[PDB]
Amino acid sequence: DVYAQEKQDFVQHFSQIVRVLTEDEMGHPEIGDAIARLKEVLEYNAIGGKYNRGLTVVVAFRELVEPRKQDADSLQRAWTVGWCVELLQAFFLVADDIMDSSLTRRGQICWYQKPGVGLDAINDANLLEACIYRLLKLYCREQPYYLNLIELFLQSSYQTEIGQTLDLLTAPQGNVDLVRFTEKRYKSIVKYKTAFYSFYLPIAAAMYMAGIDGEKEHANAKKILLEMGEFFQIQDDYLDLFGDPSVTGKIGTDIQDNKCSWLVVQCLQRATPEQYQILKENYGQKEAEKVARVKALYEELDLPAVFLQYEEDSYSHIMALIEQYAAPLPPAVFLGLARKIYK
Amino acid sequence: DVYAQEKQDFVQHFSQIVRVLTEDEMGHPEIGDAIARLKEVLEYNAIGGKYNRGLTVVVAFRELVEPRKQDADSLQRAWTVGWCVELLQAFFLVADDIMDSSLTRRGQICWYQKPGVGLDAINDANLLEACIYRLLKLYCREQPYYLNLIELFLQSSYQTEIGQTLDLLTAPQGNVDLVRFTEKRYKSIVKYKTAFYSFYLPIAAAMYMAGIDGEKEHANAKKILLEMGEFFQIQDDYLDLFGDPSVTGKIGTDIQDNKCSWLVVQCLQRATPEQYQILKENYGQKEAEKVARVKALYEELDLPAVFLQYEEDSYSHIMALIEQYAAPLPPAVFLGLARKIYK
């Protein structure tokens, strides 16, 4: 795929990002110790993932911009804006792992769990966020899209933070309540906390870099991308349990962690008073036996079949969304992304 | 003073800020619960202080802009940018109180310590930061200084975060070391963590709003304001101990909290090997007797006299800085601020 083609150049560019960001202690030797800590924070948190969100900027750039205008400088800017997306995610992950007491992230121990780090990781998360705007100034200050990119990264941080607030209010640690776990609530959490920054932001960033700044074009691209975001998170909640972890790189911690998953939401909708009481008793419990009972209840309520009928309607619908709203953008912009998610 | 004159109108404008920020759930009823939490976060954290940093924007605006151009709309923008400074501080305080395990802030319990809040306050701090850029867009999008304000608020967040990193590395909780407590380190911490956002940011924001965007003018104003910032923090560290808390609104928690204070720094400089060992044994201890021994050592080393000779040299020096670097700005811009700090 077009993602694997662009990966190597993109991952190689991280060294440049780190160099340019650590080139602040040249004239200001006084902050050197802080800059060394910033480097360590970048290396641990911005590296070790799939880089899919960041690569989406680069892939979309290649497809939106005329090959003739894709010079050395424009590509460097595309790889930087791609890394800004990856930094925005690192900032979210570092902080979210603190708030939900996570132990591991991308196979390794969470940054905040590292000895000597702890709650200092809050400042580290803030620094990761600050790096975006430093990189945008260093690389894009002179571009006609500079302001659009700044506003886009700010609006996406804001939407994600609203999504995170909504998530925290729905699943309060200690105040365990399944009444709050509605489809309307789930869809809003997914839209604000995940779909905007993961799907709309990288394509939207690529669009502005190509000079596509029209509100209607951005509204059209957003209608497609937000639906792709809903599907992705719904599919990810299934794979957390009903998915053979050979393919993935994570296992079912959602039942024991008391998460507002798409599974628990459908389970509640299709529940009899007795079925609900079983879920009420077993969901969110650290006990192995209790986790095993929820899985059995999900299987009983046709949830692997419910997810298949959802996939079916979703495959056709995203194709309808691309058919109707991709123009004037090349449909391959959305299709290349949908292939990675839907297959 | 000119600060007390502008206070009432400024504090009354908070209601408008909260209304405009909570006017996002009109078209998006789905995020209503999150917006209610944002309102509660604003009301608890942005209110209850002296509002000095925010008022500095408004006072400086009144003195920099021609009375004829100070219309209804321009004043609303000045009060909003003043509130953006107050929000930037709320974001820093909420987060810093988490990182150093603070119990109280402005006489009341820290937000994170409130039952049901806890580490959710990290998201709350992030939301407070996001509100700045929302207010700048809502009020200043159409102004020729829009971008300058965005970049100024971003650069100030970055400088404060670097200052906070430097502070955390100097005073690691558990890894108690006085060797790190140097004057060069203290001055860098104060400059990055405090002086930029408290002194340079509000005047600089007022300057851009007046159309004063020149690099030399900003460099001149910064030379004055950074020295005012150094003095302020040095004076504040003294008042923490040697200052009768009748005047202030806080007491000596710096010795027991193991802080890199200007006092402990001078104490180390003027220490014999024996005097250092006493400090090494008693500094950073929760024990009342141990806290009492440090105070006695500071008194012995002429530290109230050392601070007076510092005040003397500082009074003349800031007057020299204003004399030399205020032009073309009215010197009252800096003088009105220095009066509040130096008297």
Ligand SMILES: O=C(O)c1cc2c(-c3cccc4ccccc34)cccc2[nH]1
């Ligand atoms: O977050 C992960 O580890 C992950 C990412 C993906 C993606 C993916 C591929 C290409 C672009 C994307 C843009 C936004 C979100 C996800 C993608 C497809 C399948 C599984 C995944 N897991």
Ligand SMILES: O=C(O)c1cc2c(-c3cccc4ccccc34)cccc2[nH]1
């Ligand atoms: O932070 C507090 O509570 C406080 C603020 C002040 C100020 C002050 C006054 C006017 C403008 C300022 C701008 C930046 C920093 C401090 C000021 C003068 C004395 C004591 C203070 N305590």
